[PDB]
Structures are given as structure tokens and as C-alpha cells.
């Protein structure tokens, strides 16, 4: 996977709500991963690696 | 060779007991205490025993009777020898 920013969905299966979901992921060539992801409550989250 | 054991199975119905009994007989012949009841075609003790099952001249009853007889065949020999062991008194 190429280094950069990547926008995914994970629609369907997540929490079986059909509400889908959305996540962005910053993948460096060398370094820690910066992840951003929503939840069913529409609260934005962030996780390192 | 014996291709199909169907007849041997026919005689003694269990088919596992066929293997067991035929094994006992094949042992009686292999390490020789005894000799075949049917002409040996160069067939090994296995097939000879199976043939003997097919001809109905060998089975658990017969073998047990023969062995029980042999117990007394040897018992009649030592009859003087073991009664000579009265030293236990």
C-alpha cells in the first residue's frame, strides 16, 4: 500500500446497523500510523497505530 | 491367491472374527506346531487358513476343541512327572 492518506468505508458489517461508517488512514513510509474513524454515534475518533 | 473372502465370511458371519480365527490358524501353521488341512498351493499361511475357513473344517469351535484336547495330551505326559512333585507335602 502506497504511503499517503487513504479513505475507506467499512460499510455493511460494522455494528450491523446499515449506517455504514467512514475512516481515514495516514500511512507513512516509515513511522507510526495515524488513524481517524467514526462510530455509530457520529463521534470522530483517532488512534495511533 | 484368495481374491474374495466372501465365502469365508459366509461361514463365520462376523467377518472380524474371520480375521481373528484365520489369524489364530495361520499362527498354528506359521510357527509350526501343526500342518495344513488343505493342499498348499504355495499359498502362505494366511491364504491357507482362509481356505481352511472356506472348507468349513476350521473355526473357533474346532480350534478351541483341538487346543483343549492338547492340554490333556500334554497333561497325560506329565502325569507321572508332576505327581512326583509330592515334595510340596
Amino acid at each position: 500500500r502506497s504511503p499517503g492518506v487513504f479513505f475507506d468505508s467499512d460499510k455493511g458489517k460494522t455494528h450491523s446497523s446499515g449506517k455504514v461508517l467512514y475512516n481515514a488512514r495516514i500511512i507513512p513510509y516509515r513511522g507510526s500510523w495515524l488513524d481517524f474513524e467514526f462510530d455509530p454515534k457520529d463521534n470522530l475518533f483517532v488512534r495511533i497505530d | 491367491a484368495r481374491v474374495t473372502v466372501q465365502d469365508a465370511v459366509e461361514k463365520i458371519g462376523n467377518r472380524f472374527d474371520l480375521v481373528l480365527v484365520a489369524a489364530r490358524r495361520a499362527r498354528q501353521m506359521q510357527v509350526g506346531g501343526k500342518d495344513p488341512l488343505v493342499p498348499e498351493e504355495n499359498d502362505k499361511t494366511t491364504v491357507i487358513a482362509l481356505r481352511e475357513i472356506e472348507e468349513g473344517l476350521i473355526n473357533n469351535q474346532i480350534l478351541d476343541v483341538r487346543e483343549r484336547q492338547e492340554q490333556q495330551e500334554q497333561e497325560a505326559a506329565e502325569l507321572q512327572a508332576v505327581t512326583a512333585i509330592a515334595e510340596g507335602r
Partner: protein
């Protein structure tokens, strides 16, 4: 709403929570939180997209 779910208040607090998230079980330090957070995505050493 995200801010409403945010347990922290200021910069230092957030840095403490992040440091505690990355390396839990051990006591946080100001210099440690700053060093870590600056060394993660902002360091020319530990980070490159090229």
C-alpha cells in the same frame, strides 16, 4: 459531540492521555509527553512519508 466525549481540557492534559495510551502502566511526565508526541509524527528522524 466529539468534544463532549473528550475527557481532557488543555494541551498538557491531552498529551498526558496520549502518552498514557501509547505507553500505559507507567507514570506520565511533561517532558515525556512532549518528547513522545513531538517524536511521533513531527520528528524528522522517526517519521517520513518521503
Amino acid at each position: 459531540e466529539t468534544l463532549r466525549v473528550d475527557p481532557t481540557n488543555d494541551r498538557l492534559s491531552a498529551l498526558v492521555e496520549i502518552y498514557r495510551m501509547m505507553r500505559p502502566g507507567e507514570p506520565p511526565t511533561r517532558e515525556a509527553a512532549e518528547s513522545l508526541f513531538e517524536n511521533l509524527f513531527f520528528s524528522e528522524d522517526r517519521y517520513d512519508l518521503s
